[PDB]
């Protein structure tokens, strides 16, 4: 069973599934431990379990695989990974891992990883032969990002202005200087829509702090 499947489900569907399983009232507690308990049940009676997420190394040597829908937070949803993986496949902080998991046995409360199926959407064999980050040779912007869609709606013109004010390409550093109440929120929203519409091949991430 995939974790991301129960992840993209709303809380009501998790409640309905837990009541279909015939257990203690699960709607009472967190989505986190809701998914935890329904997974524990369905894994008591079910296949191999599958999961995916991003890995963070702890100072104890082990690692935690967490979900972005929980914004990479600590909780029962996390997947425990042993340092033996971080020696065999030499895992790293921030690796997109997807693999098989099982329920925790006596005294344990974190799902244990079984076998890594995809490391950063790629082969673990090919996960060894990789290049280091700061060891790379940086360069200036070579390929430009097309933000103009060509339809000219009420908001698309905004992006068009950028295309004639400050062109952006892959590898460029953009800094927005704006006082409060200036309309930067939907500015980033329109930019994200345009770059997601024009380039569905590059993985796009946003960050909202406070």
């Amino acid at each position: 069973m995939n974790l991301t499947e129960l992840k993209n489900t709303p809380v009501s569907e998790l409640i309905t599934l837990g009541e279909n399983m015939g257990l203690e009232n699960l709607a009472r507690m967190r989505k986190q431990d809701i998914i935890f308990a329904i997974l524990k049940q369905h894994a008591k009676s079910g296949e191999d379990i599958f999961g995916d997420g991003v890995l963070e190394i702890l100072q104890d040597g082990f690692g935690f695989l967490r979900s972005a829908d929980s914004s990479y937070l600590a909780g029962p949803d996390d997947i425990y990974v042993s340092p033996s993986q971080i020696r065999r496949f030499n895992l790293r902080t921030g690796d997109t891992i997807s693999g098989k998991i099982r329920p925790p046995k006596e005294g344990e409360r974190y799902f244990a990883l079984l076998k890594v199926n995809e490391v950063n959407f790629d082969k673990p064999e090919n996960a060894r032969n990789k290049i280091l980050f700061e060891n790379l040779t940086p360069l200036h912007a070579n390929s430009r990002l097309r933000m103009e869609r060509g339809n000219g709606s009420t908001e698309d013109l905004t992006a068009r202005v950028l295309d004639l004010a400050s062109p952006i390409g892959r590898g460029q550093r953009g800094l927005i200087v704006a006082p409060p109440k200036a309309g930067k929120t939907m500015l980033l929203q329109n930019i994200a829509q345009s770059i997601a519409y024009n380039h569905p091949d590059c993985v796009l991430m946003v960050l909202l702090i406070d």
Partner: protein, 50 residues
């Protein structure tokens, strides 16, 4: 001729053998669930019972 003398050698050997069979039962109960290419023969045996 019927009474045998024992020294520190085989006495310590027997005590180490008792510790060894203890940790061997421990690591055998542990390995009964282990799988392939998931552990090194370092944490399988505990140094504390020896």
């Amino acid at each position: 001729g019927n009474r045998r003398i024992r020294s520190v050698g085989e006495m310590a050997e027997n005590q180490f053998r008792v510790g060894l069979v203890r940790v061997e039962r421990a690591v055998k109960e542990r390995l009964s669930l282990g799988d392939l290419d998931t552990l090194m023969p370092q944490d399988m045996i505990n140094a504390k019972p020896i």
